[PDB]
Amino acid sequence: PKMKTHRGSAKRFKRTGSGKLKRRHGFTSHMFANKSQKQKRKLRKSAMVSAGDFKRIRQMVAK
Partner 1 sequence: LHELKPSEGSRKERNRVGRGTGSGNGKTSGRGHKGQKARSGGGVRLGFEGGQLPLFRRIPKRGFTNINRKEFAIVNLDVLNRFEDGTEVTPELLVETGIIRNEKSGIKILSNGNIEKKLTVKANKFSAAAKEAIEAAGGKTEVI
Chain residues that interact with partner 1, rule: CB under 8 A: 6, 8-9, 11-14, 23-26, 28-29, 49, 53, 56-57, 59-60
Residue 16 near which of partner 1, RNA, none (CB within 5-8 Å, type-dependent): RNA
Alpha-carbon distance 62 to 37, whole Å? 36
Alpha-carbon distance 39 to 8, whole Å? 26
Selected from 7, 10, 14, 56, the binder of RNA by CB under 7 A is 14
Alpha-carbon distance 62 to 58, whole Å? 6
Task: Report if residue 42 touches RNA, rule: CB under 7 A.
Answer: no
